Structure formats: C-alpha cells, structure tokens
XYZ file of C-alpha atoms in Angstrom:
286
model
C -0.021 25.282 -35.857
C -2.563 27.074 -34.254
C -3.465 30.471 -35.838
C -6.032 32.739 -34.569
C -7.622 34.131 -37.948
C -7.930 30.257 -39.266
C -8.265 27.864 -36.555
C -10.260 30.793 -33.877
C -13.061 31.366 -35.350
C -15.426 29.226 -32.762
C -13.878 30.120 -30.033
C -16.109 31.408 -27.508
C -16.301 34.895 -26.299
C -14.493 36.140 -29.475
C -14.865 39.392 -28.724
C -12.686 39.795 -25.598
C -9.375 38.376 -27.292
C -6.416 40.441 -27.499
C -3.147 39.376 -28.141
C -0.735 41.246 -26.217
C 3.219 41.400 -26.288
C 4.868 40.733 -22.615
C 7.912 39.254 -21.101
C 9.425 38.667 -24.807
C 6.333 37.242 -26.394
C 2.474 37.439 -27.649
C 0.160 36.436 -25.142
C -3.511 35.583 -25.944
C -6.019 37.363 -23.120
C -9.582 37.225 -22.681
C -10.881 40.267 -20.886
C -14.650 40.629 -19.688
C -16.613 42.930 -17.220
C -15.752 46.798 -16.427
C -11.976 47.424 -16.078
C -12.751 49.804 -13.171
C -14.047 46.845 -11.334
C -11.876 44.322 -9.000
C -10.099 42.309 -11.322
C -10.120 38.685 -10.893
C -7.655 36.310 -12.774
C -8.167 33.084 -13.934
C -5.479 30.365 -14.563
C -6.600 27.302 -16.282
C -4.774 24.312 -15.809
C -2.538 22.010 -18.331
C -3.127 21.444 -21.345
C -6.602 23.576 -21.526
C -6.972 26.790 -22.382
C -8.991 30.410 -21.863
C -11.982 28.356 -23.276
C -11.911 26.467 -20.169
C -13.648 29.739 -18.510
C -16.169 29.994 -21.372
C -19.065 29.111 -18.453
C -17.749 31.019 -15.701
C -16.248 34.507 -17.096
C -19.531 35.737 -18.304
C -21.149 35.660 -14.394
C -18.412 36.421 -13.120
C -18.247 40.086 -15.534
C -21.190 41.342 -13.827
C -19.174 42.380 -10.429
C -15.705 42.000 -11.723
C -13.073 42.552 -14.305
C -11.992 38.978 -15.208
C -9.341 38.604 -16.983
C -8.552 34.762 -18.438
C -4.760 33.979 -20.451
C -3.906 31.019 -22.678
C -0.624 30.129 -20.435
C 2.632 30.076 -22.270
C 2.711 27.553 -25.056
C -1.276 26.834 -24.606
C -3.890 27.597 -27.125
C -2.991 30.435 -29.512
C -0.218 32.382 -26.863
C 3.075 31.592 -28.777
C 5.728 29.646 -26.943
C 9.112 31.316 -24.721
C 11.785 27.637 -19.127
C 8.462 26.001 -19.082
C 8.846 25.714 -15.115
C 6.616 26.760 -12.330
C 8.371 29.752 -11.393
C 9.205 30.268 -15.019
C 5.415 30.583 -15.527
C 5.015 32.827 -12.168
C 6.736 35.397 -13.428
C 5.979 35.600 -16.898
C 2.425 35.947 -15.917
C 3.373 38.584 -13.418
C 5.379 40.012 -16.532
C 1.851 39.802 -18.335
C -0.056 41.749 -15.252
C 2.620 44.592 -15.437
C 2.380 45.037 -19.104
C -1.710 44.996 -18.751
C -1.398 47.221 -15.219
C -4.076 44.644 -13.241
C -4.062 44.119 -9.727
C -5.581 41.104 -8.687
C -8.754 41.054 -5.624
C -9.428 37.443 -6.522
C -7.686 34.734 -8.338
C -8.905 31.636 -9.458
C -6.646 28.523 -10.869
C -7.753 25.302 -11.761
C -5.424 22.270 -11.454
C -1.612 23.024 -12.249
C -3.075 26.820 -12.659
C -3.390 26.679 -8.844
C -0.148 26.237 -7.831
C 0.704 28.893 -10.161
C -0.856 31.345 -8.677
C 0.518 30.594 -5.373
C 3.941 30.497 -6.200
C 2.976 33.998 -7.623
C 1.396 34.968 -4.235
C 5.065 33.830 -2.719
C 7.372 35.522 -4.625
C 5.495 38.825 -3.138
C 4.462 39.764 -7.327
C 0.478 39.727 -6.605
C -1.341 40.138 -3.331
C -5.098 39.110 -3.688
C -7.385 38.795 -0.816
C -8.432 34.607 -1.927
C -6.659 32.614 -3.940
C -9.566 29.679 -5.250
C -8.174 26.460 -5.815
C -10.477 24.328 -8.305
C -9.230 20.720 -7.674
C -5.775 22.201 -7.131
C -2.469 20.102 -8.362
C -0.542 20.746 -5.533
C 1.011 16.964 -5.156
C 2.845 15.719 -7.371
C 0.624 14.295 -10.206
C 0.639 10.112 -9.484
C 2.760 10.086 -5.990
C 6.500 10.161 -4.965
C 6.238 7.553 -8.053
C 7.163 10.821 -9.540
C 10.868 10.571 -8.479
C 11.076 7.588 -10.554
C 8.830 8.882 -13.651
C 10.095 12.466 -13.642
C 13.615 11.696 -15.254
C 12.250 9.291 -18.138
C 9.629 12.058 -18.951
C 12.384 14.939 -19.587
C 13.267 12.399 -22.307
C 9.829 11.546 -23.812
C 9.745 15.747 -23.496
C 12.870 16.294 -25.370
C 11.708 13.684 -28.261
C 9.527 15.995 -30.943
C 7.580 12.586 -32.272
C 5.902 12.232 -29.197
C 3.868 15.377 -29.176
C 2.939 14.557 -33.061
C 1.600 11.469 -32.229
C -0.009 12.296 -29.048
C -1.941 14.730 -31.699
C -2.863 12.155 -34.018
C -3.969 9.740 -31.977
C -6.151 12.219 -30.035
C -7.686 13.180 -33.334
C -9.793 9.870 -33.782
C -13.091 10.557 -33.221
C -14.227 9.092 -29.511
C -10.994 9.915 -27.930
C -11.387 13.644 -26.669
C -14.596 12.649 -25.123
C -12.923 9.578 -23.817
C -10.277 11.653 -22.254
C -12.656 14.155 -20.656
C -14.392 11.263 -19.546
C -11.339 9.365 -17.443
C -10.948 12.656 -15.701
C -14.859 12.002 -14.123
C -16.688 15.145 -16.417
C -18.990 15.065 -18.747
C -19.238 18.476 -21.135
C -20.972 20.186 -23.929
C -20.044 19.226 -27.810
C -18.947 22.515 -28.575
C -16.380 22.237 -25.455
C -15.423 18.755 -26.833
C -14.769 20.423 -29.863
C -12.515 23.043 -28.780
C -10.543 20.906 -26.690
C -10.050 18.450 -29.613
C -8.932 21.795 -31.657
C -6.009 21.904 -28.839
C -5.215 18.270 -28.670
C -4.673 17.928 -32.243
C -1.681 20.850 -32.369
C 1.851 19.133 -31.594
C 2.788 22.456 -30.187
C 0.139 22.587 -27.436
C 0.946 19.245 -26.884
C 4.188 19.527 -26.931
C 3.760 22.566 -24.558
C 1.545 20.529 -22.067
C 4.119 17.784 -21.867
C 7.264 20.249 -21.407
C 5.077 21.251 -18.280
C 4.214 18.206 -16.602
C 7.866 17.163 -17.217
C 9.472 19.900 -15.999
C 7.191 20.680 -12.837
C 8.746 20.355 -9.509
C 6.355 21.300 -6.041
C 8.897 20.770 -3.098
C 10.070 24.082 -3.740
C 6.146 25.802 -3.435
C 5.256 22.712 -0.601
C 8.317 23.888 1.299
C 7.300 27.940 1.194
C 3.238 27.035 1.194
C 2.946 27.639 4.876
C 3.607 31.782 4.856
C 0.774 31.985 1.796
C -0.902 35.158 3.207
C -4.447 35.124 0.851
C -6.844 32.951 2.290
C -6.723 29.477 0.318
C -10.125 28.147 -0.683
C -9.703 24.411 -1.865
C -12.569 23.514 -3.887
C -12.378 19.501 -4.511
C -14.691 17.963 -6.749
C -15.218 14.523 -5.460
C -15.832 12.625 -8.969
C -12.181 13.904 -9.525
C -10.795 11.263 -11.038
C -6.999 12.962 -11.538
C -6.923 14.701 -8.894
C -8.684 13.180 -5.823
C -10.285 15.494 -3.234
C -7.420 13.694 -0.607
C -4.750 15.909 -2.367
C -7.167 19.211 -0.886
C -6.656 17.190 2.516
C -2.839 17.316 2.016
C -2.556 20.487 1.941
C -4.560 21.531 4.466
C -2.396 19.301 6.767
C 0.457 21.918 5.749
C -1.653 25.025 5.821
C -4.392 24.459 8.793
C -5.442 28.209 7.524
C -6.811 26.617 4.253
C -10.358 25.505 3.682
C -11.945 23.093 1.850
C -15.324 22.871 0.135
C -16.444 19.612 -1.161
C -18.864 19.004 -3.906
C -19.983 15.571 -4.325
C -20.171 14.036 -8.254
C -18.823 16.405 -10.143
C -15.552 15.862 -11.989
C -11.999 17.568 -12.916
C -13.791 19.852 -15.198
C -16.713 20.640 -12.775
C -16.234 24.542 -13.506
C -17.175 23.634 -16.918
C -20.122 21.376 -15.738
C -21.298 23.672 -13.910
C -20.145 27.097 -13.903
C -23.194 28.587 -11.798
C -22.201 26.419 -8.740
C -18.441 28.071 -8.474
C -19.761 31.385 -9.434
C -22.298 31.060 -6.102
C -19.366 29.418 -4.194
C -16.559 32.263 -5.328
C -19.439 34.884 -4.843
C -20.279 33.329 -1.215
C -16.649 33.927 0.211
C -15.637 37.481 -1.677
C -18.881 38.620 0.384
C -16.889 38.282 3.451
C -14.526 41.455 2.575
C-alpha cells in the first residue's frame, strides 16, 4: 500500500531517504550528518517508523553520522521470519551492504532488544547501546504464555490487519492511541503515524512481530552484553513501565538507569533535546 512517490511526500527529512537493496530486499534508510563521523544507529520500535527520529536525528547530525531504517515490513521498507533474531541479522545484513560500524546505538521499545540481540550474536560492537523505554519483558507479563499462541492465529488471519486499518482511520483514534501510551505529540507526527496505521501491510507487519517475538532466548544470553546498557525509562510510560528498566538491571547489575519523570512512551518525540543532552552526556565519557 504504501508507496514512496505517492504516499511520502510529507515525510520529514525527505532528503536523506534512500532505498537500498540488502539481505533479499529494499530497505528504506534515512542518513544524516558526515559519513566520516561515528555512526550512530537508530532502531525505532513496533509499529513506528524512521519518522519516529524526525526530532532527534537532526541534533544528533552535528557530531555523528546517524543513520535511522524503517524495520522490515514498517513504513515504506518492503516486507521478507519476522522474529527477533530474524530482524538481528537482516539489519546486520543492511550494515554490511551500507559498510557502517556502529559507536552508538539507540533503540526505542522492541528496537532495543534488537539491537542487543545484535550486540550478542558478536555482528556489531558499539561502545553504548541506549535503551529508550526498552521492551525487554514480555509485553503484558508471563500472561504472554497464554496470549502468545491465540495471537499466531489472529497473525495468520489477513482481515485483522484490514480492519485494524480502518478502524484506526476514524478521526480521534491515532491521537487516542498515542495518548494511552502517556505522550502527547505534534499534528504533523499524528499525521504520519495515522499514514502508517491506515496500511494493512504495516499493520499486518507490526502484528506478525508482536506475535512472533520470544525474549527468553535474549533474557537468557543478556548477562555477557559487553556495551554499556543505558536504560532510559520514561516514567509516564504507560506500555512500558519504568519497573521493566528495574528488571533488567536485576539481570545485568552493569546496566544503568536514568529516569525522567512525566514524559511518556514517545518521550524522544516529546522531547528530542532532553535525549540528545542525555545520549551526548554519556558518549562524553569515551
């Protein structure tokens, strides 16, 4: 559904798309900032996009070379496993093909446990990974055990992406969405993300995702992370509650966490300036 010449015309930061072939398909990549620089890599989380870093790739340009994908399925990068370490290495598929070598990496939500199961398989090796309101539970509880069977069948139904879409379409109900997660954004970001909600293949792509996504494996292998692990937990973070950055901490005493009171799941997009000072604060320290 989603075509970049018809339905890509807003999107922000225009300029910097590219759409590049790697690991058997067309990716979508935003690039900013001098790509002599250190390269840092942002992973948004599900069911978002590259637009998600529309705030925070233009500071972050000045000192590095950021570099932002639409993950598989998302936004206008075409669709290949839709798994965790499916993802992992069809990024680091993506990083080959573009020759980058990450300093920094930055993943918000689901995009954070990405990028550490990347760090673990050995296939990147950046100095601090950045965790913005990390998924690194299970999304709900072990409640999962019992709703991750029934979704692999809601996943393998095609109406329920299509009508997902259309009901997401009424007016009110992006906002309302945005909303339940604890943020409160701009009307052109509303407007993107209603863009993305109303394609049944993003959709559908999102839902494969959450479906198929499994974190034993990454909770198991978490301990021997060797970046250093800032958790950033925003505490109006409705979906992900700033306990979850507590969690993990219990498993990896190395990590650290840095709390920011009020803002929500999209508090990168809130307020972009904040994490730039707070990712700016720690790469100082190298």
């Amino acid at each position: 559904d989603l075509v970049w010449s018809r339905d890509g015309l807003d999107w922000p930061h225009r300029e910097a798309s590219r759409f590049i072939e790697a690991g058997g398909f067309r990716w979508h990549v935003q690039r900013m900032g001098s790509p002599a620089a250190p390269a840092i890599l942002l992973i948004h989380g599900t069911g978002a996009a590259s637009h998600s870093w529309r705030g925070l790739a233009p500071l972050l340009s000045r000192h590095y070379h950021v570099v932002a994908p639409d993950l598989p399925g998302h936004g206008f990068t075409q669709t290949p496993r839709m798994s965790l370490p499916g993802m992992a290495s069809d990024l680091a598929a993506l990083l080959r093909v573009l020759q980058v070598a990450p300093q920094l990496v930055v993943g918000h939500s689901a995009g954070a446990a990405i990028l550490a199961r990347m760090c673990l398989d050995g296939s990147i090796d950046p100095k601090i990974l950045f965790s913005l309101n990390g998924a690194f539970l299970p999304y709900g509880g072990p409640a999962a055990s019992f709703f991750s069977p029934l979704a692999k069948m809601l996943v393998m139904n095609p109406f329920v992406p299509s009508l997902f879409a259309w009901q997401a379409g009424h007016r009110g109900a992006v906002e309302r969405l945005i909303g339940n997660t604890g943020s409160t954004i701009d009307p052109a970001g509303i407007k993107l993300y209603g863009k993305l909600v109303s394609s049944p293949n993003h959709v559908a792509a999102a839902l494969r995702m959450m479906a198929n996504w499994d974190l034993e494996p990454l909770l198991k292998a978490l301990p021997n992370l060797k970046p250093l692990l800032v958790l950033v937990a925003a505490e109006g973070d409705r979906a992900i509650p700033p306990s979850v950055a507590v969690k993990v901490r219990e498993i990896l005493p190395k990590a650290v966490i840095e709390r920011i009171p009020a803002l929500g799941h999209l508090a990168h997009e809130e307020r972009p300036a904040l994490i730039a000072a707070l990712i700016e604060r720690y790469a100082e320290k190298l």
